[PDB]
Amino acid sequence: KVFGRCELAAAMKRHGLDNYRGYSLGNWVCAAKFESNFNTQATNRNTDGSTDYGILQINSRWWCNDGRTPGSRNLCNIPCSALLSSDITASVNCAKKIVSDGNGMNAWVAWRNRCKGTDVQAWIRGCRL
């Protein structure tokens, strides 16, 4: 599923991401835009052999099991395919663990390079929340 900007903002807000660990909703919408272009089915392979899955591009080296990343962990206790669903619940629940790991949203490279320090409120402007 390819979300609209305000549709995703509302789903993220309903799942408790607004101000989760101090990160306002606009940060999460901005991260999703640049990680996946709002597409729940996005996948990208990394040079180490791990793969990133879903709207927030969660990586199989640490967070989910895809059966093809040797020596990896599955800290969210989910198959990576669960992160590609049109229902974002699994992605949001796993993202909450990632952002609590100690590095905040810096774990998302696109957030660090394209959202951090910008006017992220713009990503929710005009939405009925």
Author numbering: 1 to 129
Paper excerpt:
A crucial need to continue advancement is the efficient delivery of fragile and micrometre-sized crystals to the X-ray beam intersection. This paper presents an improved design of an all-polymer microfluidic ‘chip’ for room-temperature fixed-target serial crystallography that can be tailored to broadly meet the needs of users at either synchrotron or XFEL light sources. Crystals of two model proteins, lysozyme and thaumatin, were used to validate the effectiveness of the design at both synchrotron (lysozyme and thaumatin) and XFEL (lysozyme only) facilities, yielding complete data sets with resolutions of 1.42, 1.48 and 1.70 Å, respectively. The chips are compatible with different sample-loading modalities, including crystal slurry loading, micro-batch crystallization and vapor-diffusion crystallization. Diffraction data from two model proteins crystallized on-chip demonstrate that high-quality diffraction data can be obtained at ambient temperature using our device at both synchrotron and XFEL light sources.
High-resolution diffraction data sets were collected at room temperature. For lysozyme the structure was refined to R work and R free values of 0.185 and 0.212, respectively, at a resolution of 1.45 Å. Compared with the previous generation of chips, the diffraction resolution for lysozyme was improved in 0.3 wt% agarose solution. One point to emphasize is that a single chip was sufficient for data collection, requiring only 0.6 and 0.3 mg of lysozyme and thaumatin, respectively. Additionally, the lysozyme and thaumatin samples were crystallized in situ days in advance. We have maintained samples on chips for weeks with no observable decrease in sample quality.
